[PDB]
Structure 1
Amino acid sequence: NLPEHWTDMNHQLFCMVQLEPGQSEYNTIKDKFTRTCSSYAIEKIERIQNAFLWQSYQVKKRQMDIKNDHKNNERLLFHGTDADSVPYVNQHGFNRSCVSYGKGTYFAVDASYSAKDTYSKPDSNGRKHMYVVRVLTGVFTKGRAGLVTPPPKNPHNPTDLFDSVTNNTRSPKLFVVFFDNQAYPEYLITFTA
């Protein structure tokens, strides 16, 4: 079933819902962004209500919670993208087919890393786009150029994989996931430098 904080979708399966500034949900997401991006200007925040992406994500979450025998497999991370990818992500999520720690989709711990113009490319009017993403990072190891999946947890058990890779395991600043339904885009932040 669809999370409690969602709003009614009149029997539809997809909706982008603008948050009211100063209400609790808006303040919580705004604070995560302004922790490292307080010099920027927030035009709006939208909640992504994608029923199909949510269902597929929650399945993979239940599966990861069984496989790893604990429930700290999920992290809140950031993803900067160009305005032309936004409609695709809203509808179909992150696609690795669209890379120094591997050929997957990249998420940042800090909004400031996602805020770089090379990730959240400014459009004509200077508008920049960053997602807040639920990511199933699960059990992770250091990444390396050319990975197509995470490496195995043991060379003698070649099909038992890590869930994600990172730049640095003691102190991660990015995570790379290699499979379709391992990230759910929860909020879109429209903002300017």
Structure 2
Amino acid sequence: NLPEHWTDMNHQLFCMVQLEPGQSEYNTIKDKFTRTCSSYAIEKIERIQNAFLWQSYQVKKRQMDIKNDHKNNERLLFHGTDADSVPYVNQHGFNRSCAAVSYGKGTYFAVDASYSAKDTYSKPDSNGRKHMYVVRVLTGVFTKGRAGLVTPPPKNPHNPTDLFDSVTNNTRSPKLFVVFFDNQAYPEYLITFTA
């Protein structure tokens, strides 16, 4: 069930596709970034076409849509990372066992590209090039996080296995989300940019 806007992969299961500047898809992703990062220069935007990661993510989305009963469970968020992690993320997605874990031992995603654009996250390589993913994240129903969480809290401690889907810094005005399971984040685009 590979998305329409993906381009043909000649029966391959993984491809990175450089977007054509000035076309609708490139403009849409560029705008999401320049909303908070207009002072940064975009070198390129690549579409991540990973069939296996997409399949596993879409199964989790269908399950979360059933479990939560309607609800838009999905957010488009940012993740800054170092150049040496890019090949792993492209192929394998986001792994909590790799990665400050102030809101729990999960993978961290920012509402604003400006947050992920910090050198602590999108570490400049030898050439000054920084890397940030645009990520589909199953944030679902969320609560405030805290240090040391290995899974989100239960929605009521009377049923301690019925969990929140994610945690945040601030439930009323969230700026970051943490997810604790493989299959809850799909890296959709990679932005290569400079300060």
Q: Same fold (TM over 0.5)?
A: yes
Q: Return the TM-score normalized by structure 2.
A: 0.99
Q: Does 1:111 align with 2:113?
A: yes
Deviations 1:144-186, CA, capped at 9 Å, x for gaps = 0000000000011000000000000000000000000000000
The alpha carbon displacement at 1:42 in A equals 0.3
Q: Where do 4+ consecutive residues of structure 1 move more than 6 Å?
A: none
Query: SS at 1:85's partner residue?
Result: helix
Q: Does 1:13 align with 2:3?
A: no
Query: SS at 2:178's partner residue?
Result: strand
Deviations 1:63-85, CA, capped at 9 Å, x for gaps = 00000001400000000000000
Count residues in correspondence. Answer: 193
Deviations 1:98-134, CA, capped at 9 Å, x for gaps = 0000000000000000000000000000000000000
Unaligned runs of 5+ in 1: none
Tell me, in whole angstroms, the C-alpha distance in 2 between the residues paired with 1:48 and 1:185.
7
Tell me, in whole angstroms, the C-alpha distance in 1 between the residues paired with 2:20 and 2:32.
16
Find the partner of 2:122 among 120, 123, 145. 120
The alpha carbon displacement at 1:38 in A equals 0.3
Query: SS at 2:53's partner residue?
Result: helix
Tell me, in whole angstroms, the C-alpha distance in 2 between the residues paired with 1:154 and 1:54.
31
Q: Return the TM-score normalized by structure 1.
A: 1.00
Q: Which residue matches 2:168? A: 166
The alpha carbon displacement at 1:92 in A equals 0.2
Tell me, in whole angstroms, the C-alpha distance in 2 between the residues paired with 1:66 and 1:171.
26
Query: SS at 1:153's partner residue?
Result: coil
Unaligned runs of 5+ in 2: none
Q: Percent identity?
A: 100
Query: SS at 2:133's partner residue?
Result: strand
The alpha carbon displacement at 1:16 in A equals 0.1
